[PDB]
Structure 1
Amino acid sequence: GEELFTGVVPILVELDGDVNGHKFSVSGEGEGDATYGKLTLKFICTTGKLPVPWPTLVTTLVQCFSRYPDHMKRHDFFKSAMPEGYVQERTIFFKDDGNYKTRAEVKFEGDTLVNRIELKGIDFKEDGNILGHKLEYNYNSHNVYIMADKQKNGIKVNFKTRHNIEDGSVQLADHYQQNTPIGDGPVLLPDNHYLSTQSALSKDPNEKRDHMVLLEFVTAAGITH
């Protein structure tokens, strides 16, 4: 599955969601270079105006493109489950607000890596930072902690994200994630480690549609040479 990430791979992303009764859809296209843990993606909201702030969907909208140092490659679960893929699930808790439940399947469809996602958000405050759109248009760096779940034959992941708010405060979100292989093949279960991630959010000036462009860098770490 690692021989599939040697060059630039095209990515296609589709999400169908509902937040407090609000339904919307997003589509995305881009590519990734696992060689530099590099991602470039543009997303559009197909249903009109996105009901939630864009930064809240960054973590939902492809960790098989992380950069794994040569000594740690036997710890790359995501690429070992390829091409069949893996399911990725999450419950994201926004402090003092709602939460998202998400289920997605990430796999190879021909030569494109697709990420089909489903999302339900419940309990959002009508005048919170989220439904109230008080988040600012930017992102911070974060470290994603990973460990093997030998029972489900996958990995469990937990991490928190800080989102800057307009007024000067910060909105936290706790992420609980699990990944399981689709294929019956043996995957690589990793020793404990983490992923350092950095993203930048921007807009395409010639774009009339509600969208978000994203540049991200992901590198693996936390295991000794």
Structure 2
Amino acid sequence: SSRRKWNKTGHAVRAIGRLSSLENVYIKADKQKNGIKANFKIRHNIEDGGVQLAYHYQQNTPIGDGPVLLPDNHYLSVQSKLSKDPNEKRDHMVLLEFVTAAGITLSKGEELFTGVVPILVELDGDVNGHKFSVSGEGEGDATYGKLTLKFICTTGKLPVPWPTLVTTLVQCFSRYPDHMKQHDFFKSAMPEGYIQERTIFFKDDGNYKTRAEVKFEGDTLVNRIELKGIDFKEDGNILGHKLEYNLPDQLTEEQIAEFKEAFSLFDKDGDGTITTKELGTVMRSLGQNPTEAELQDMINEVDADGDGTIDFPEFLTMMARKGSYRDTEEEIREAFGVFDKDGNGYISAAELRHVMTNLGEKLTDEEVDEMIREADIDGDGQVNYEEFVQMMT
């Protein structure tokens, strides 16, 4: 009962947190090279709690002379599942991906991706002097933005965690909606292909420099990559293999139920969609003052159909992703600061009362005190950072 209030409010706060962040693959045109630039952020869960961030900068240039499509600013959204082959002795990765383009509200090479295309991947790498090779094969179905691939480390033991290689290991398989067909540089550069260059900064650790050639060889789409890693800590999350491999399908029906409870705090008229006005209302009642522009930006970050609203499914998707990948300490501390309005490091009854009252949740002072009780571990009559965290898991 009180836990439900903590989780509902918590989920609402973390939802605004997510809508404030930039979690997609952001693509912009680069006229100087008739290609595109991209930038994005990857969250890698750390085995025993915590998250390792990987910041990506990306550049793509066509290989051929033929005309290509230069996109308006937009993004790709990616869902990955990593798994193992039960009958594989070798160090390997089974990878399933769904990639979809969005971010804009409501070519010849494209023809090559109408059906299922075979894929081959070859990677030679060197990180802090630890050399390795990866070879992968599978297929892509751009109609659904689907990729399915199996990768083998052909030199024995992979000296870095599989998850860190994923973004390096064919964005031409992304699904562009009809109203965005003209923004698909990747397919447009086919069959001759493109060079794709990245630098990937692992926070508080080393970096990768990758150069890859993505093109058709016969009927097969082939990605050939070289990767150099430097400045890695030998006992860090990467070289020390401290990153989790997979996340669960989870979503205990109770979790979805909680997501829905959070959703209905935003959807105050119960039409199954959240507007800029609704998102705004909640944000203000939490003590923020975003402008209409910002509201539109936040919605566009998750607005799959481009209708300018967050509908219930889009919200569920957003929350499922937010539940998969852990938040940084700073993010949790900001969430905390939403309650800890004086910044003293402690959530007092008066503060929790201010929040719940402004939120519209009408309860008695005794109910507030009960919430504090449910949260209070050490018994000081307040909620501190650590208690907050242990509450929001």
- Bin the TM-score by the shorter chain: 0.5 to 0.7
Aligned length: 148
With over 3 angstroms needed to count, the CA separation of the structure-2 counterparts of 1:81 and 1:6, relative to structure 1, is same
Distance in 2 between the 1:35 and 1:87 partners? 23
1:12-51 deviation digits (Å, cap 9, x = unpaired): 0000000000100000000000000000000000000100
Question: Where do residues 100-179 of structure 1 align in structure 2 (5 Å cutoff)?
Answer: 100-138=208-246
With over 3 angstroms needed to count, the CA separation of the structure-2 counterparts of 1:124 and 1:39, relative to structure 1, is same
Query: 1:23 maps to which residue?
Result: 131
Distance in 1 between the 2:111 and 2:241 partners? 42
Query: 1:87 maps to which residue?
Result: 195
The code of the aligned residue for 2:147 comes to: L
How big is the shift at 1:169? 7.9
The code of the aligned residue for 1:96 comes to: D
Structure 2 spans left out of the alignment, 5+ residues: 1-108, 249-300, 302-321, 330-393
Query: 2:116 maps to which residue?
Result: 8
How big is the shift at 1:127? 1.1
Instruction: Pick the structure with more helix per residue.
Output: 2
Q: Post-superposition, which runs of at least 4 consecutive aligned residues in structure 1 deviate over 4 A?
A: 168-171
The code of the aligned residue for 1:125 comes to: K
The code of the aligned residue for 2:130 comes to: H
Distance in 1 between the 2:228 and 2:327 partners? 26
CA RMSD, Structure 1 to Structure 2 (Å): 2.2
1:121-168 deviation digits (Å, cap 9, x = unpaired): 00000111111110001269xx8xxxxxxxxxxxxxxxxxx9x99xx8
Q: Does 1:59 align with 2:167?
A: yes
1:53-97 deviation digits (Å, cap 9, x = unpaired): 000101000100000000100000000000000000000000000
Distance in 2 between the 1:31 and 1:50 partners? 23
Larger Rg: 2
Partners of 1:55 and 1:139 within 8 A in 2: no
Q: Higher relative CO (CA 8 A, sep ≥ 6), structure 1 or 2?
A: 1
Partners of 1:92 and 1:99 within 8 A in 2: yes
> Aligned to 2:152, which of 37, 44, 52?
44
Distance in 1 between the 2:247 and 2:181 partners? 28
Distance in 2 between the 1:11 and 1:71 partners? 27
* Secondary structure of 1:10 counterpart: strand
The code of the aligned residue for 2:210 comes to: T
Distance in 2 between the 1:55 and 1:77 partners? 26
